[PDB]
């Protein structure tokens, strides 16, 4: 498995080069959710091909690949959002042409999930989260969120842990500052998980009331029910 025979720098480059592009969008309740659903539907296609480029992911069974994506897709969309929203305090940059404030989310029964997202973005901003750490985190979400629902995955996760540390030690972080920052980053993954779960429920609520969902997007939702 090539993912294990890979150095930290080669891991970072591999992840940085696999980054999906930043898509563009095309407010009432259906208007806003229409654009988000449309946007999410298009990103999923890039996400799937991004995942196949995440080291170790290709070694997994197709069934397992399907499971990890089904579990982590909204988490991954959300940490993407939070990341690119960093340089815009108090704002959510879903797309370059779709920048939203909290007041826009209130036109949907949503503001609670907005604030959590804005809060996560504030956290990243406060920590001065780097791009190398971001791509590490995002791959961790992919491989971890469905693993307990398999030694290969744990050994790849460890490898990514090694990479996160290798980055921190490169930025001049002390030994104590290295493991402290690791836990800080990893603990944020609990919140992204929470935001995803709260997001899912809101989408099932939307699906039973009929914005029209993509068949691919519906296929992802039904996996969580």
């Amino acid at each position: 498995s090539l993912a294990l025979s890979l150095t930290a720098d080669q891991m970072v480059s591999a992840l940085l080069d696999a980054e999906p592009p930043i898509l563009y969008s095309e407010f009432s309740e259906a208007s806003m959710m229409g654009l988000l659903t449309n946007l999410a539907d298009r990103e999923l296609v890039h996400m799937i091909n991004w995942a196949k480029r995440v080291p170790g992911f290709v070694d997994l069974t197709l069934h397992d690949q399907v499971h990890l994506l089904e579990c982590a897709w909204l988490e991954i969309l959300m940490i993407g959002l939070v990341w690119r929203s960093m340089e815009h305090p108090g704002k959510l940059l879903f797309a370059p042409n779709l920048l939203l404030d909290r007041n826009q989310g209130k036109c949907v029964e949503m503001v609670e999930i907005f604030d959590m997202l804005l809060a996560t973005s504030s956290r990243f901003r406060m920590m001065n989260l780097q791009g190398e750490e971001f791509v590490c985190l995002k791959s961790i979400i992919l491989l971890n969120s469905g693993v307990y629902t398999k030694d290969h995955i744990h050994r790849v996760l460890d490898k990514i842990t090694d990479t996160l540390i290798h980055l921190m030690a490169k930025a001049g972080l002390t030994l104590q500052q290295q493991h402290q920052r690791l836990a800080q980053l990893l603990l944020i993954l609990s919140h992204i998980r929470h935001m995803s779960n709260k997001g899912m429920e809101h989408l099932y609520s939307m699906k039973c009331k009929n914005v029209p969902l993509s068949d691919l997007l519906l296929e992802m939702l039904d996996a969580h029910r």
Binding site: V45, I48, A51, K52, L62, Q65, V66, L69, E70, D215, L216, E219, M220
Partner: peptide, 8 residues
């Protein structure tokens, strides 16, 4: 499932 096809 669509995921099957997209992943290959």
């Amino acid at each position: 499932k669509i995921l099957h096809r997209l992943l290959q």
